[PDB]
């Protein structure tokens, strides 16, 4: 009765509400791509380090 009146009135008279995707964007985090896929740095090239190291530590066995 009154159930029908409200049901009818509500359903009919509102069935669109605001909904803008752009407004949503403000409220959410932005996708941005990773940075620095940097390849590892190469170090201690040559036996220069090794010859230095054999000499450098006097105690090679004591």
């Amino acid at each position: 009765n009154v159930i029908q009146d409200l049901y009818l009135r509500e359903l009919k008279d509102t069935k669109l509400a605001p909904s803008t995707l752009q407004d949503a964007e403000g409220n959410v985090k932005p996708w941005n791509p990773p940075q620095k896929p940097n390849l590892p740095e190469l170090e201690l090239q040559g036996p220069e380090a090794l010859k230095a190291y054999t000499e450098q530590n006097v105690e090679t066995a004591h």
């Binding site: 190291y53 054999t54 090679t60």
Partner: protein, 85 residues
């Protein structure tokens, strides 16, 4: 990171050890020692290396050469007693 290379050099536990001094000693001393010897008693060989062998070996301190030598001196002056008689 990569384990260091000091342990791959040894020349300070090979020359840096105390028994090295003993080693170079006992390679000379023992290596260059005849395991056995020539003959212990042999001085005065003319059948008196035999005198040495019976009496003046380190195998005896037996009183026999003492007796013999004493008896020699008894024989010396006693014969001269009868030479002076």
């Amino acid at each position: 990171v990569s384990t260091l290379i000091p342990p791959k050099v040894v020349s300070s536990k090979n020359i840096g050890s105390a028994p090295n001094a003993k080693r170079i000693a006992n390679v000379v001393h023992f290596y260059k020692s005849l395991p056995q010897g020539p003959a212990p008693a042999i001085k005065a060989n003319t059948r008196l290396a035999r005198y040495k062998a019976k009496y003046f070996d380190g195998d005896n301190a037996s009183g026999k050469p003492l007796w013999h030598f004493a008896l020699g001196i008894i024989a010396f002056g006693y014969s001269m007693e009868y030479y002076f008689h």
